[PDB]
Write a protein that binds this DNA or RNA. Structure first.
Ligand SMILES: [Mg+2]
Ligand SMILES: [Mg+2]
Ligand SMILES: [Mg+2]
Ligand SMILES: [Mg+2]
Ligand SMILES: [Mg+2]
Ligand SMILES: [Mg+2]
Ligand SMILES: [Mg+2]
Ligand SMILES: [Mg+2]
Ligand SMILES: [Mg+2]
Ligand SMILES: [Mg+2]
Ligand SMILES: [Mg+2]
Lengths: 88, 106, 14, 129, 55
RNA sequence: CAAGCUUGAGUCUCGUAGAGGGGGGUAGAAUUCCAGGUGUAGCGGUGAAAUGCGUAGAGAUCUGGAGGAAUACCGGUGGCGAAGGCGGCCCCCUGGACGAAGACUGACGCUCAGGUGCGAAAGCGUGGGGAGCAAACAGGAUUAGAUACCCUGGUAGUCCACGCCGUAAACGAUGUCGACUUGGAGGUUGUGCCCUUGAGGCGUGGCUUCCGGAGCUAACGCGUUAAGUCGACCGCCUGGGGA
């Protein structure tokens, strides 16, 4: 996905400590920065339909993880949607 | 940061122009935080098959640890210069510092 | 074969 | 996947009974104890033990005749795709009353022979043939 | 671990006509055999081993 | 509904393998064209011949250059990918798969009618490109006729960009996922320990082929990768022809 400095910092941004890495809100941010990383790639590489499968995997993976926090605790849901720029 | 092994061979009629190209390319690398690991001059070397109607090509082997700034410019100035007839770069696994088997026998 | 398939459409009698 | 764990339990019993296995192991639960303890009290199996509390592992001791299968066949009847329920007088028998039908009611897991004195009905679990 | 520079190893793994000997004859491991193939293809560009016995 | 728990399903790190895709360069044979040199009566092609080429010097050989497309050997029931498929090397961007040690979220899952995208080749639109191969066609044999076969040529197309077309014997002729049930011969890919006493001994996951027991099956065969015993869900068939 990214390097070590980009991965470990965002875990420290949204996690309570360095060990808070398996939570769902971190997993949204790992996919949010990755899709934002691949914005300029697929614009130049529209004939790369095989890497688009990896892109559509992560869009579908982020949608399923947003559905878990929304159905359980909407207070943490309303924080992260505007903090990363979701809901369009 | 990537670890590159850069192989470039020099036209044999300009074999004295080789130490000029060694230290001009090095100053652009080390200024942008680029390390260096191996710099071995081999002299003339017999070819397995002729290339560009020539024989006895000059061989210089390199190892450059540097970011992706040098990978844009250095391969273009190889194609811009007529002295370098073959240019070849490759990505390695680690920063390595070890003499070639050409130097260990010669 | 599945009972849940027959919820959508039963067996078509000729 | 493992969505019907009772049907997964019946799969692990029927295989090792036919393949001459001495003992089998399986992940435990509350309902799997409430079925194997009834089969222990109905002469089909021998003994069961529990192992582990954070990963409950159930074990069953097999039973043979001369190296022959005691439980010849067992049939899952109700399932998560189709639920089966009967009343106190519509309780089906297995082999005209030879085999037992495991029916769980509000008074615990019992047989249809034991449901006559109880007078209840509910969910059919398996035909112990 | 394997490398293209030691041509004395590569001379034992080729023919007189520059053909790459497969792992059936030499009996080497299949992990190195893919690596020895690309190591010759590095050396084939650098004019260290001949292509054919024609030239 | 409420509070949970961790084996399901996920997240991080350290790693390893690979023709995974896209983009940009680059190499050397071979084919054909063209230039030059030496050189002479046939070259070419088939079962046999002819059309065709060549004394303006063919063919053959050597030097030099141009363009085009494909990547010998490696290379193998070998690897990768959801599949069709994917193969010179190198760089850049990027995808999934798998293993080890733990840490962490706490069922976040499975499945899918409409919908959505990919999807061999032929062919279609616009603009390039052009060696070789090659529908239609030209010509010569064959023949009763040759329309086909065979041979000498040859356009569309094969190539690239930009779209559209969405069908195949698109086949493992087996939809996906999970749980279990004796085993071998191997391959590939790792990892843990061991007089390291050798690239070995002992284990142990991922992937894959051939045998084969019980069991199943109409037979063929399948047989821990099931077509064995079961669950979750979906598609599809109802005599042949019409179609
Ligand atoms: Mg990766
Ligand atoms: Mg050529
Ligand atoms: Mg916890
Ligand atoms: Mg047309
Ligand atoms: Mg023809
Ligand atoms: Mg066209
Ligand atoms: Mg069809
Ligand atoms: Mg077959
Ligand atoms: Mg048998
Ligand atoms: Mg078999
Ligand atoms: Mg009909």
């Amino acid at each position: 996905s990214l390097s070590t400095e980009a991965t470990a910092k965002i875990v420290s941004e949204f996690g309570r400590d360095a060990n808070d890495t398996g939570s769902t809100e971190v997993q949204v941010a790992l996919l949010t920065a990755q899709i934002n990383h691949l914005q300029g790639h697929f614009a130049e590489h529209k004939k790369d339909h095989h890497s688009r499968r990896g892109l559509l995997r992560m869009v579908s993976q982020r949608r399923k993880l947003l559905d878990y926090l929304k159905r359980k605790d909407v207070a943490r849901y309303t924080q992260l949607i505007e903090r990363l720029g979701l809901r369009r | 940061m990537r670890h590159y092994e850069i192989v470039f061979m020099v036209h044999p009629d300009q074999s004295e122009q080789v130490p000029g190209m060694i230290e001009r390319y090095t100053a652009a690398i080390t200024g942008a935080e680029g390390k260096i690991h191996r710099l071995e001059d081999w002299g003339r070397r017999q070819l397995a098959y002729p290339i560009n109607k020539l024989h006895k090509a000059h061989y210089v082997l390199m190892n450059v640890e540097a970011p992706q700034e040098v990978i844009d410019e250095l391969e273009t100035t190889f194609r811009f210069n007529d002295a370098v007839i073959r240019s070849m770069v490759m990505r390695t696994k680690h920063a390595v510092t070890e003499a070639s088997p050409m130097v260990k026998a010669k | 074969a599945t009972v849940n398939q027959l919820v959508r459409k039963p067996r078509a009698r000729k | 996947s493992m969505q019907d764990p009772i049907a997964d339990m019946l799969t692990r019993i029927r295989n090792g009974q036919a393949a001459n296995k001495a003992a089998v192991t399986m992940p435990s639960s509350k309902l799997k104890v409430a079925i194997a303890n009834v089969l222990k009290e109905e002469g089909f199996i021998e003994d069961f033990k529990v192992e582990g509390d954070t990963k409950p592992e159930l074990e069953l001791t097999l039973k043979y005749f001369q190296g022959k299968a005691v439980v010849e066949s067992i049939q899952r009847v109700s399932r998560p795709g189709l639920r089966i329920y009967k009343r106190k007088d519509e309780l089906p028998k297995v082999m005209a009353g030879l085999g037992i039908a495991v029916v769980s009611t509000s008074k615990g897991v019992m047989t249809d022979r034991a449901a006559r004195q109880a007078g209840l009905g509910g969910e059919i679990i398996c035909y112990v043939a | 671990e394997i490398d293209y520079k030691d041509i004395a190893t590569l001379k034992n793994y080729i023919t007189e006509s520059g053909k790459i000997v497969p792992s059936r004859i030499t009996g080497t491991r299949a992990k190195y055999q893919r690596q020895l193939a690309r190591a010759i293809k590095r050396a084939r560009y650098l004019s260290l081993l001949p292509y054919t016995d024609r030239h």
